Design a protein around this ligand. Structure first.
Ligand code: NA
Ligand code: NA
Ligand code: NA
Lengths: 251, 251, 251, 251, 251, 251
């Protein structure tokens, strides 16, 4: 009954939308859609919850990716089969540089490919680079709403734990290749870790699709505080504001 | 109030469970749990839906992993922090060998690592191999219900599309190293594709955890039919019966 | 005059044998054959000594592989051209885990591929995994004769010295990639080192042949004692008993 | 008497310059410098010819890199030791996409790393990405002079011949991994080949330096014409005007 | 009673020998030793048969390596522990270039590393190169007996079958990365295949030992004839005469 | 007007020359040519300065390569299109072994491939090995003029700074893969670092061209002195004498 294998959507469901905002968490989709006009629930299958809304009179889709490159790759492919050509990722993230503060915004120009799915689209030599128009719209949007913004490289990991050098785990073990890797990325000016951008950016850049990514900083691993839940939600809302404002300039 | 970062579970929720049945789809969790005694919904956050039930008087957890190694690695880690030591993967799958029929059951001895998350636990040379006791229990359980069973190697891909050499896609492109890859795996006796076992098996085998995997066949790509909804349901139930029977012998 | 390039055997020499027991040392072949009925010498060319015997009325071949993947790959290929479909490796080995004692038996489910010849059959991503029927027969055989058995992963090295992190050598040097590697394997639960199983298991698993491996523990590198020669021979004989008993269940 | 090993320059020679325009050809340096105020020849050693000039009252250096990552890496390092923090690459290039015409301008967002020197600064997974402020200034400058501009990915090769899949050569041979590579890059949206950007961008992005790249199109390999000398000169001047205008906004 | 783990030799057995002639086949050792003065059998264990003889009044050892890098690496290590510093490989080989005729002699300057054991001594980027003094002595010796000699690169494979692109095998399959590989080596001027030189040369070059290799051509795969037994014997003797003559100048 | 894309040369310019001496520095070419008869300037384009001269009545070309594999690869290809079949590299170099003294001569048998351009001609497994005739001529020439000569392996790096483990740099950073690499090469008997030989030797050895390399030692990194400029020039002249004398024996 669906037109795609996983999302549970038909072409008609999108009502001509060609831009998607793609958060990770299905439970966050509704909140984003409600910033815009006539928000409606389209489907919820597996980790993929999708809502439609209208932005300056144009249909947009908000669709969750789940955690990681593999589910992200399914969402992007199936949305592309449904007519989406522009993908904007919104998230919240840690930072790994001392000058980046909680509440700041990160716009990702390109990703360190510590994932597997990106390799299914392009060999490692190929850059996991964002579309310039999307990045520009995100930077301008952040400037417009008075954000403190950092623009640069993000490390994109297939794991939350060892790939980000976390040792407070069941085994306490980090495999050799990843032990000391965080210090390496820090030394090269990498801003932060997350888990989807290498796949998203590589997939889009090699498939004629436009992608960008913005995130709000909720923790800094170099001066690590327990996040205040109110502050997290405020930073999340701030990043969501930026991604929607950027989308307006990409329609 | 959660004891873990993603699953929204406490140690108390598990009531001493040390075995988890782990399907991919959150909506499949309830149906598996309800085959056992005193099933109770625990939590639903992101792609992770968890239920507790009782098997021969012992608590067991059913928890979804989402699609792909990255979310699987989070579920396994956090379940391990909550006391789970044995993980049984249940799924439905296609097959890529002519002798494997729809309705047959596949037990996976090891995976071809076409993923990224497995590398965050062990270098590529390390085998993505199942635990012998889990594999034995699954094979025995399949025999007990009179299944037609194939035991062998599964190719575990970070993508549904190019990594499984699908061409009916947005771009119709498959990157060089995956072009012709399906024929290679077929020639080497690989049974099927799926998207989580390389991570699950590598992780568990390198972290002192036990893992096995069973799947019901719903399609064969060498003799490809549209699956019948009734047949898929019966195959799902057949495979679920096998995984629960295996769990009985692993408590 | 021979039917194969290296083994010095004809098809008729095997008298219908479809199972081979494959030790490393040519000088050990006769001893194994003599456990069975009507043992006869077939050939001795290079490192390949072969004997025929009968097990429960069926011809079996015992053929040495020499040390390493390359000569093993020749033996397996040429035996396969002579009708052998099942290969059981028997050896004696060190262990690298504290809980494994001298005189214990190891059944290998899969190998860490620290060899070169396995790559000539399958890319690194492919698992060097044993056949489930062979592994089951070996586990059951070990259980039957009262062995203390460990089941799991073996590191399979192209060298005896640097690849197993031995420093009491001519140069005392271990190349960077291998320095500290033993600790890595130990941390991942690897049981032991040997030198042929990655090739044997990868070759067989990718070529439609069945293979398994059992070994007797003669030394433990974590609590390292000089082996008593009588104890070594007894452990060797015990492992040989197990491999022959397993073979009976694979005919 | 030089402050650096190769360039033959002193700190004093730069007169406080912190921005460099870096063409490949030493003979191109004078022409670029003479577009600005008070141009002066500084030094010529090996492939490194350097001139100083003034732009809006501020000192800027023009320095050639030679062909390839290795000489580029020397120039960037030694210029950084002399106070340069911003590097703008100017070149002329072919194109490999049908929609890109002779006389068009290419701004590079990131490079495919088909080089070796980039690996001496960051592992392959790290993106060879341009600085956002530099890329923005180049795009804005191109707009200011009314250029037809394409913004995207460039393939950066350590060779002119096999790495760009040229067959009209001494041997007519292209090694396996480069045979068919051009079609791969074309399918992934790559604009053009050149020979320095992977090193330049990776180096700068991992060392806290800012880099961008602009190039004028002189030939298109999908519709290959012999370039007219007059047209090439005009295109060179057009691109040089763009890089100088961008430099104005980066001082 | 042995001083080494595998060879069954004592320091005394060598009587001060510091040069070894190392054929692959244990049965070839006696014939080589008997060309020199006072030949004596030392030991035969596994694939390692050793004889001592005298050349211009000086002790030399002839010791077999078995097939492949792994057993070769054991022989070289243990001979080095027994005082051997110079290793001369003697073999017979096929050729893969049309200009190389049966009965010709090949002196190997370096090897293509299609093995695994070489990597246990040096990373892949390190050249599997022969010692200049050994190569010179072999070339001079070949000239002294009036050989037709080709000097160049040999491809050194961990397998006899797929790594040398043989298809007349059990499976008839050659894994992707070896399919078409022979044509690649031919185009690059590679003379021949064998199975030990990558390990021998890499090991020796990285461990302060001297190694060279000479081989007599018995077949040419571009103009493939069944070898005549008489011709092979003559070619063997011709090559053995060369290796002994070279040894004279390396004492 | 030129017959090649970069060198600015025609076939006639070479007057039948089939041997090239290839230094790095364009400003050094004239000095080398003037050792021979009738030296004349042919062209100076980019980093490629070429002079013709006559050696024992035969035309020879001296042509600079610039720094690095990429420009070297252009020079070699274009000279080959102009009829050059033999390439002799002359340089001055550091040494990394304690026994090598300033003023000594190094003849390179093969290179460690720490470059990128070599991979555009042959996969990493292929040896970056010099031609035996060229190496022999260089060794004999060094012996003839009373040089103190070391023959062996050179590490060939795409960078001057991090690839040779230099820390007195702008960032002071050396990427993980290269940190501690110098000690590794020293332990394997590598003589020295330079920047072009991996490309030159790999390219030539795989393309049917003959290449060799000789260098004068101007510094030893293990007992590091500031070079005396007079000593440097004398050592340079000594190495130039050797390369020209070798060329006489290769015509
Ligand atoms: Na997921
Ligand atoms: Na062997
Ligand atoms: Na250059």
């Amino acid at each position: 009954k669906s037109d795609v294998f996983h999302l549970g959507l038909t072409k008609n469901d999108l009502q001509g939308a060609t831009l998607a905002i793609v958060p990770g968490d299905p439970q966050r989709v509704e909140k984003i859609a409600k910033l815009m006009d006539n928000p409606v629930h389209l489907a919820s299958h597996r980790e993929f919850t999708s809502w439609r809304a209208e932005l300056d009179g144009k249909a947009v889709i908000v669709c969750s990716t789940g955690i990681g490159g593999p589910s992200t790759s399914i969402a992007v492919e199936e949305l592309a089969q449904l007519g989406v050509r522009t993908f904007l990722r919104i998230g919240t993230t840690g930072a790994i540089q001392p000058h980046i503060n909680v509440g700041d915004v990160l716009v990702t120009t390109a990703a360190v490919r510590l994932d597997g799915a990106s390799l299914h689209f392009a060999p490692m030599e190929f850059p996991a680079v964002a579309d310039f128009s999307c990045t520009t719209a995100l930077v301008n949007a952040a400037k417009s709403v008075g954000a403190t913004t950092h623009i640069g490289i993000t490390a994109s990991s297939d794991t939350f734990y060892p790939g980000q050098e976390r040792y407070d785990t069941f085994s306490g073990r980090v495999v050799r290749h990843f032990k000391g890797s965080m210090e390496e990325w820090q030394s090269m000016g990498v801003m932060n870790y997350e888990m989807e951008s290498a796949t998203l950016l590589t997939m889009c850049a090699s498939q004629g699709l436009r992608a960008g990514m913005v995130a709000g900083v909720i923790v800094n691993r170099t001066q690590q505080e327990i996040p205040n839940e109110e502050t997290m939600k405020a930073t999340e809302s701030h990043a969501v504001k930026i991604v929607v404002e950027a989308a307006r300039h990409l329609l």
